[PDB]
Amino acid sequence: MIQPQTYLEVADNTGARKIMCIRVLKGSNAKYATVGDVIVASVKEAIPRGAVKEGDVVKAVVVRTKKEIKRPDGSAIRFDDNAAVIINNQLEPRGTRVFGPVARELREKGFMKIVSLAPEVL
Amino acid sequence: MRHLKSGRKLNRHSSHRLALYRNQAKSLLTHGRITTTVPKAKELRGFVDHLIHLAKRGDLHARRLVLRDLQDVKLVRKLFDEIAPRYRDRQGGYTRVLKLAERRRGDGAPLALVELVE
Amino acid sequence: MKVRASVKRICDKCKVIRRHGRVYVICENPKHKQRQG
Amino acid sequence: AKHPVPKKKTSKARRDARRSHHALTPPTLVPCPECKAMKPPHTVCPECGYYAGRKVLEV
Amino acid sequence: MNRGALIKLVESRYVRTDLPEFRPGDTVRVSYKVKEGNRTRIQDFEGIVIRIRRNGFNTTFTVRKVSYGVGVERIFPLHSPLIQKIDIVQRGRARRAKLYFIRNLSDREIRRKLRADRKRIDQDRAAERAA
Amino acid sequence: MKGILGVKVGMTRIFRDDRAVPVTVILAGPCPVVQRRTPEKDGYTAVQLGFLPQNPKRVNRPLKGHFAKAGVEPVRILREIRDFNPEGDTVTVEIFKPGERVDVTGTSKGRGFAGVMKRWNFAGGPDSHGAHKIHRHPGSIGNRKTPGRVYKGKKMAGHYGAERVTVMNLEVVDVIPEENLLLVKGAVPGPNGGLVIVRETKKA
RNA sequence: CGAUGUCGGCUCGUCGCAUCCUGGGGCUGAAGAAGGUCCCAAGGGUUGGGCUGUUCGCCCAUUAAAGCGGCACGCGAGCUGGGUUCAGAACGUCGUGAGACAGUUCGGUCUCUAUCCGCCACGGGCGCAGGAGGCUUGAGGGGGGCUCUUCCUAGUACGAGAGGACCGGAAGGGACGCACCUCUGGUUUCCCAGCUGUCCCUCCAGGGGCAUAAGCUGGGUAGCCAUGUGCGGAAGGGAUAACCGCUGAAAGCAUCUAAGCGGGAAGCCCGCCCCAAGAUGAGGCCUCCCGGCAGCCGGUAAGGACCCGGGAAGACCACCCGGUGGAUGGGCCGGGGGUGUAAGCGCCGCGAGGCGUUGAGCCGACCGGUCCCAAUCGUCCGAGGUCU
């Protein structure tokens, strides 16, 4: 459950550190963002001289949520953070490599790039 | 919505309900028969039945258990001596509740006596 | 279907017909197709 | 809350009309099987003090 | 009728039996089936069982491992057929049915609060001895 | 339109094809037929089902005669399946089969005199910034002097639930004939043990 | 003017269509796609945020779209009081001054009890020409009605290419509505455990009170729940709007119309759910009941009520259930579930403590059994069937 004003750890090496979700790109009145969702955020924090500097409005994707994620099997996973990957406008990770685990729903949503770069998909 | 929720609030907060149960039980064991409002009685059936059941068990651990509530040495002694035997062959139904025909004048409340079964 | 109040012939092929009580300027030319209202 | 107030005096017929349901049901009594005295059912006969054909209270 | 007995009757055809008993605080490597792409592969999720809500057949449990400095918690239906096998890699000695406080503890303190269970461990060595 | 009486015994999820599909379990059968609504005799077509059986000392003379007119045992509850002519004398879960879509109706859990939020999901008022004693009130209810009244059906307080409810198009996850149990995906209106009625779904 | 409370915001809507999207269609400077314009269309929707008291507007990111308006610029006996507009204060300015502003700025009491109509729920009475108990039908009324993306169709048609379809299917979403608690997650007021101070029981140990109307903390059953699960918008039929037609005269031709027939939309009616015979038009089916003085009275029939014992039923009432044949509730037992190894004892420790006994002990609701305790005995109402 990611909603606007939320802070997200960027999971990749784009340069940012955290991004504030300001929108959830799933229909018009989408309440919450979750794994595999496309949010639009601001770069509230970036490494010096990274690819992106602060204030950049960027499309990202949630890859981990401290709110658990059920599954059709019955099992459910829950991280201890909120992470996103700063993607381009074409569903390609703008960063070269992701960090930390990710969720499997990304494979279900055409994010095999991020699934691949994931050091540990779950 | 009180759906399936067991127990009466009795218009007393938690500790007051509990001390009510303790004092009610104390007077009951000390007298066998007592007169009290109906709902207090029916909310007193189980609380007495449990103590008398530990009476039937009689061991030391039960002594400290019932003693956790009654808080008396003497009255608990009578419990484990006069009542534990007399209910040694009764499984539940350690108390009886009869409703009196005459309401309390001061408030019109209905009365009923709770008695230890014979 | 040019809807208006001053339905009128434009070309000679503009032909008026009082269809369904309304006045329609039916013509071979689609542009001249007019409905009075 | 601007202090709502009765607009008009309640006419007598309307007052009595609302008091229609104010009747008091008579307390239903059954004769005590012991002493044949009337008393509320499912209670102890305060006259005989018996109940369920046996003694309960000391009249 | 016994609604409960009917429930246990229904679930009874689905209750898994072979899984090794374990209590919270222990450590587990769950061989859990996965349907990736179209094939299926069993990945092991090894962490601490920080919770077991026991509801009969609907009983499930929580595993917790730190994947790349990231608290990864997971919830498994205790009788899920997808759960291939469970592995008691460690009889941690918990002291409460629920172990949420480890969420806030550094791993040094996490270990220091979860010591091995001499009783259940020694029972393990006692068992696990074929004819 | 086939349909059987039943009782809600509880909910549960099962594992059907590696999917913890939650279901509710419904003791449906065995429903004996007691009377058949024929249009020449009752203006329409339907049937009348008994579930569950009743202690004979708990049945008035009229009901008893109503059973003796059939060959049916005295039964506690009795209902009607509209537009359903069961051939046999006792409808069971046999009419249903797994995967079949059904519609289930039962009385919702009666939530007493429910407030306006719980009953209609009104927003209420704020919890700070000075809201004076109206934290859960519905605010305004109408307009000023025009129309100077309150429309019919304005969402106000009242008994939420405790009414007939029909959730529809559910899936018959499984049938259990020997037990007369029925496993239907999704939840069913009513408390555990609450009477319910299952029927063919009107969807397509 | 012996008072009609004034902007704004919130809550709650309802309605008009001069339609923002969704539906249908015409024309095009409509190749396709995308558009423009107009026509019919109000079922549904019409996002979130920054600034500002603001409405408004700009902007941010979206969206199918981010409609315009009425309802006392809706709504203060529903809320707020930010602005305006009481009294204090200050600035610019005007005034000699006292003071003034429509200019600014900081501050500034918003009044428990609903009589009637209305509305939301629930009942009592009577009626429903014999009395009851069940089942129903459904006059009619309400609810709901949505929409998007992707895939195939098909890179097909179109198109130099670029780009890129119709139609028809498929799947997945968003919001919303209903229901439910299997799962997740909350609470879970004393169900479990631990800890601090104090005082007390009883010295130790072990407990109790108080620390909140739980002392705090760690959990958490059932129930209630959403953030969780399922389900829904239908499909279809009918008559239609715009519009498109067949036949076709008046009027030798043509003409969608004048006789006719048809197609034709998120539209209307039905269809789905819900309510529903006070539907006084009181409906229909099944079953049960049978005299002394249009009636009268009688105990009464059937039956009901009162009375308990309760209930995911509930403010009360009502409804449901049970009433010795009883498992209805309390007990108890067993399972579930929770807490998490009781005390005591033994051993190891200088001791704090640790180990075994021990997944023990306790254990609210949960699921069944058991008549241990209670629903004792009971009382009273309630048929003699209007007339053609």
Ligand SMILES: [Zn+2]
């Ligand atoms: Zn022309």
Ligand SMILES: [Zn+2]
């Ligand atoms: Zn007597």
